[PDB]
Amino acid sequence: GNNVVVLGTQWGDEGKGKIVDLLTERAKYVVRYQGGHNAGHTLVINGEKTVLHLIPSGILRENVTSIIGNGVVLSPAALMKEMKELEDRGIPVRERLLLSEACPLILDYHVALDNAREKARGAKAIGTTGRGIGPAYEDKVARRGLRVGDLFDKETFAEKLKEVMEYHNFQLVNYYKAEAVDYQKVLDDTMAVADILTSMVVDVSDLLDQARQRGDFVMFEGAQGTLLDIDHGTYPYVTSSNTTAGGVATGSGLGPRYVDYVLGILKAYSTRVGAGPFPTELFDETGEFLCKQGNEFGATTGRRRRTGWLDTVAVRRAVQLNSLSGFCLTKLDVLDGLKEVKLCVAYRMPDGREVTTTPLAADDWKGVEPIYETMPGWSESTFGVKDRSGLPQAALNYIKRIEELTGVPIDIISTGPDRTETMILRDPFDA
Amino acid sequence: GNNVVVLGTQWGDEGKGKIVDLLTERAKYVVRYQGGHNAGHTLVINGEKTVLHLIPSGILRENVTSIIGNGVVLSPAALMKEMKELEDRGIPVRERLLLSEACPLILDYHVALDNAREKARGAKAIGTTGRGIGPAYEDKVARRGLRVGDLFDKETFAEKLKEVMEYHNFQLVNYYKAEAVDYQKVLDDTMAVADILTSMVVDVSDLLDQARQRGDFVMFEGAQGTLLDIDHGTYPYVTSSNTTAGGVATGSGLGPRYVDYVLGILKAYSTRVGAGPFPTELFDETGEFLCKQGNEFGATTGRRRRTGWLDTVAVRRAVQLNSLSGFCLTKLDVLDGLKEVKLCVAYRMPDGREVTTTPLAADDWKGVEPIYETMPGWSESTFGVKDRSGLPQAALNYIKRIEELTGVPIDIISTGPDRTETMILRDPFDA
Numbered sequence A, B: 001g002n003n004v005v006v007l008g009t010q011w012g013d014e015g016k017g018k019i020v021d022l023l024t025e026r027a028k029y030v031v032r033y034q035g036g037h038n039a040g041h042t043l044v045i046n047g048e049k050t051v052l053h054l055i056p057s058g059i060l061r062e063n064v065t066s067i068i069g070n071g072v073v074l075s076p077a078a079l080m081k082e083m084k085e086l087e088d089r090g091i092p093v094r095e096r097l098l099l100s101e102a103c104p105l106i107l108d109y110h111v112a113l114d115n116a117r118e119k120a121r122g123a124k125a126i127g128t129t130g131r132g133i134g135p136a137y138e139d140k141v142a143r144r145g146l147r148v149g150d151l152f153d154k155e156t157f158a159e160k161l162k163e164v165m166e167y168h169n170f171q172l173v174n175y176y177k178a179e180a181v182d183y184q185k186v187l188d189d190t191m192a193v194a195d196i197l198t199s200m201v202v203d204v205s206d207l208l209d210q211a212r213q214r215g216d217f218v219m220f221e222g223a224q225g226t227l228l229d230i231d232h233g234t235y236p237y238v239t240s241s242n243t244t245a246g247g248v249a250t251g252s253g254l255g256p257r258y259v260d261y262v263l264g265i266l267k268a269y270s271t272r273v274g275a276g277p278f279p280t281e282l283f284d285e286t287g288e289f290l291c292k293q294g295n296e297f298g299a300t301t302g303r304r305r306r307t308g309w310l311d312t313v314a315v316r317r318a319v320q321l322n323s324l325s326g327f328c329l330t331k332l333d334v335l336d337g338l339k340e341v342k343l344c345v346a347y348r349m350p351d352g353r354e355v356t357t358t359p360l361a362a363d364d365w366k367g368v369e370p371i372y373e374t375m376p377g378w379s380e381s382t383f384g385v386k387d388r389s390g391l392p393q394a395a396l397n398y399i400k401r402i403e404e405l406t407g408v409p410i411d412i413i414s415t416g417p418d419r420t421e422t423m424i425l426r427d428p429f430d431a
């Protein structure tokens, strides 16, 4: 279909960036609809690596107009930093990136608050990325936060900013007993980038409606993953935005009925960065192996990511919440050389019940235990394989089992970081 | 189609309650996906009036299971108050209402904060309903708010509540210099209703997935309206939730690809309660006439609603954002006896440009002027008319013009408050 959504079926870090970059070859637009610079998408072409955070993953393509939709919490500093870096590498960001005037703005005080709140939670800290995502959304929802459209009147913006920072500073100093963020510095740093940022502003929803009517191929790029959803995730150990497919329409302005295909990116095993329930977590040599082999460190914080087995119970919630059309299996090659491989097929509740559904809030995951189906591993190297026939039968089996367990076809398989180490069984734009 | 969404194409108060109640005759479920008790839906059967706020509008039907989805901010007090009232009138709420454990909880401190913030904004006050909606969402998004699922452990809930109220109380007393809300009272009032409330809890997304697979008729009932959207509305003069169709999936957990029909409720003229831009606002005798004839006072606050002409520019944004399938024209009879009737067809921007698109944030609506198309009125009474032929040609024309201007068919026309004073040209469940 024309409008293809690419999102994380687990807890983020499933490999969305690589897949957006890969599939945008025929796209006219790529849209970010939620999150901020907490995301960290890694693209690799001919061995050249690009790590994006706030900038959409279709930026390496001349033919694609990259869009940062209204759902996105925008940090002017993060933007300017990424733009320069990309520009210095020959990518003309200004020329191919558009942005929504509806996007809430992430300023330094948001990082202060984010830092204060995590400190205040002590050992019950969420393990957020320390980018001010949470506080930006709070301000958005309270209806006091600053948006891109406010920068269009530098005079009133200054006034509005003084008010908000006056607000937050009282709390930072008097309640949290932390350093106050200086108004002037924020005003100075922000006014130094306003013209560039305001030049990329576009009416994204109106633009998307027109593209829909023309039949342009559009790609919506998700940040984070399903179980980190603000509503449906393992609350409060979640991100502040709806990472699920409903955030596409709320975060871009495209009508919900215009989603033609939702591709769920599914990593061959599971990972989590930050605190939160995680049934299939592995603390043994296998967990270590998965981390080392999959180079599991957050592209944004460098934090070591918790590893474990693929969880079909959790993934089934993802199928459900997102109305998945197909999956893209990623990092399968990381499983090379394992004697056996395990898929969680059900949960053993603390009361003794065996369930195939997931708890909602973090608390309700307390003593939940994973029930597995152990399958044979494979010694053959799957790395960079571009065709199924190059996959060993054990590997093909693992694939089929995941499909059976979920009822959703694995349409694409990624065998390495590079754009080409991939096999597309079915193209979402053709489906 | 099986899953029909009913929402407000304007600024809320378009007549959604009556339409949900009307169309649920064949429905298995009715779901609220956003808002709280700020909404005020009025049902009228055989002259008997029911005003709902938090309870879904399919509650007068034995065959329909009413659902309050996760997107909804839930006030235990509001619930218990409505339940009793309905129960006393022979409607067994407990038996036909289910609710999400994901729903954030609205407690007294949220109303305190809501009151404090509006006072603090002085004359720039949003004109919120004073129900704590905003603060509940802030807490949700910050990841510190209490949800229905927390009530499942009365011990830890008490602890969690002490923390949050400790948090908010510091600000209420030290920053706002307002009365502190007592922890014990909140704990007492909440613990007095926990068993009833926890008894209605269900896994709504899992339930909705199963209904989808069976082919059950589902109705999603929207609160507020499009231009009050937290993202796309006339920010900051908006409500804190996405009132647009994308909130259906985020607020219920149903996959976005499962919306089969979106019915936009469109009132024959416009109204707004609370502050905010409003191009076609009428401050003349005609505005008065519209208020009196349409009994325009908020079903929740009793506040007089600002009136004006139907705005096709604004309504076109609604079409776009929600992927409208058809409209339901409401209160047409309120226009009876007008010499002439006006439809805004474009905007005259402050710089001189004539535009057919709407500004985003409130500020950008500053000196925008409405450009009209004046059509003949009608002296004939349209009240209670159940068939087109009973409509005068002028009235039929007004209808057709709205369709031409928007490109969306008016599938249902309401001619009075009663469930029957309606003509269904096309049924969303059949479409």
Ligand SMILES: O=c1[nH]cnc2c1ncn2[C@@H]1O[C@H](COP(=O)(O)O)[C@@H](O)[C@H]1O
Pocket: A011, A012, A013, A038, A039, A040, A126, A127, A128, A129, A130, A131, A132, A133, A134, A223, A224, A228, A237, A238, A239, A240, A273, A274, A275
């Ligand atoms: O893009 C990401 N990938 C994976 N986990 C993430 C990502 N962004 C945030 N998280 C996790 O989401 C939670 C909240 O972080 P926040 O998004 O900084 O507020 C923490 O568990 C983070 O580690």
Ligand SMILES: O=c1[nH]cnc2c1ncn2[C@@H]1O[C@H](COP(=O)(O)O)[C@@H](O)[C@H]1O
Pocket: B011, B012, B013, B038, B039, B040, B126, B127, B128, B129, B130, B131, B132, B133, B134, B223, B224, B228, B237, B238, B239, B240, B273, B274, B275
């Ligand atoms: O259900 C409603 N109908 C119409 N306007 C509403 C409704 N709920 C809230 N508003 C308006 O939305 C804005 C914010 O109010 P809040 O929803 O109390 O936070 C104010 O303009 C309210 O008057």
Ligand SMILES: O=CN(O)CC(=O)O
Pocket: A013, A038, A039, A040, A041, A129, A273, A297, A298, A299, A300, A301, A302, A303
């Ligand atoms: O790619 C994003 N990361 O995994 C988030 C982090 O580093 O915390």
Ligand SMILES: O=CN(O)CC(=O)O
Pocket: B013, B038, B039, B040, B041, B129, B273, B297, B298, B299, B300, B301, B302, B303
């Ligand atoms: O039906 C809801 N109202 O119009 C809101 C209010 O009374 O303010």
Ligand SMILES: [Mg+2]
Pocket: A012, A013, A014, A039, A040, A041, A042, A299
């Ligand atoms: Mg990442």
Ligand SMILES: [Mg+2]
Pocket: B012, B013, B014, B039, B040, B041, B042, B299
């Ligand atoms: Mg109402």
